[PDB]
Amino acid sequence: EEETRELQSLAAAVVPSAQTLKITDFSFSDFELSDLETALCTIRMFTDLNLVQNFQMKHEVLCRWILSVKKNYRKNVAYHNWRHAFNTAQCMFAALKAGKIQNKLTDLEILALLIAALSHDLDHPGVSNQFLINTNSELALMYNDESVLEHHHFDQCLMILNSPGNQILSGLSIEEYKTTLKIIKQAILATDLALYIKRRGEFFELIRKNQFNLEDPHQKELFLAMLMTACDLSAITKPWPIQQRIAELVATEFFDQGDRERKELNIEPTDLMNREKKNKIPSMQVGFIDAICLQLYEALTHVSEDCFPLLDGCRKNRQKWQALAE
Ligand SMILES: Nc1nc2c(ncn2[C@@H]2O[C@H](COP(=O)(O)O)[C@@H](O)[C@H]2O)c(=O)[nH]1
Ligand SMILES: [Mg+2]
Ligand SMILES: [Zn+2]
């Protein structure tokens, strides 16, 4: 069997060190890596966060789970594919390690964040929540138009975690498992950008008034939400060649949706979804950095000064895009 062969080869392979895989670097790139290499990188992330040892994960089970996750991202979507999910998880790993965020959270929270990052866009169809709503998608009906995609992504995450041979959370007690799934669900739902915009104000105000308290459960959940967003948008902080390449992937998906909107729904798409504005991608990226990213990475920097490289990377990309916009 082909799938059996893939798993037996992965499970028997040595897992290279974090150093060799460069996964502790905020400026990490997956572009020269094969699919197998990304899976090995993923095993190393779980291992170096002590999740394998601390939660008694069988090596074969972890390997099968990673392959299942990778297989459940679509191969015909330009941006919302396995590489995006993988890069999101690596940014989380780098934030927890080099960003020194791991000392502020428990092992169970770290377990949930890593799983959530890897699973956060599972089976993404390559269209937005609003498009699914306006086209009467079965997903929109099921989730009452609320964070439609994100609910779908969590459902897929749950489906995989429960499938035979993929149960990486079998070592958790029933109480721990209930708790972990709740954190994972909230973390995936947090990647809905509409929710980030809605709640970012409370987070920023807590930092401004020196009242940020991670012992408060509401604020802990809030922080996990902002971290998920920070990881999800982290391509905007990457070295220029990586950000230029990724931005074109994002535009590819957006423009394709816009073409469907114009033809099937008879509506003029917004600028970000309108192919006529391809020449304005630089101004649109600067606009996205100013409205969303800058303040998020500034806030994360106040939380942990070792997260400064994310803010620095974001600022450098704004300079690069603004030069092309002028
Ligand atoms: N304009 C713009 N939006 C982005 C970019 N990267 C992430 N996003 C925004 O943040 C959201 C992240 O959610 P995701 O697309 O991963 O499901 C995107 O849908 C999009 O609205 C970008 O490079 N440019
Ligand atoms: Mg998403
Ligand atoms: Zn995403």
d(C-alpha 235, C-alpha 122), whole Å: 18
List, as one string, the DSSP characters of 73-109: S-SS-SSSSHHHHHHHHHHHHHHHHTT--GGGS-HHH
Contact status, residue 30 vs residue 86, Cβ threshold 8 Å: yes
Task: Answer yes or no: is the C-beta of 67 below 6 A from any ligand 1 atom.
Answer: no
Q: Residues annotated as binding site?
A: 84, 120-121, 232, 285
Technique employed here was X-ray
Mutate to test the pocket of ligand 1, among 82, 148, 233 (most ligand atoms within 8 A of CB): 233
Domain that holds residue 69: 1-326
Report the SS3 class of residue 59.
helix
CA–CA distances in Å: residue 263 to residues 21, 85, 138, 276 = 45, 30, 21, 15
d(C-alpha 98, C-alpha 309), whole Å: 10
What CATH number does residue 231 fall under?
1.10.1300.10
CA of 54 to the centre of ligand 1 (A): 34
Contact status, residue 188 vs residue 229, Cβ threshold 8 Å: no
CA of 84 to the centre of ligand 1 (A): 11
CA–CA distances in Å: residue 201 to residues 81, 86, 196, 233, 319 = 30, 28, 9, 18, 26
Domain count, the chain: 1
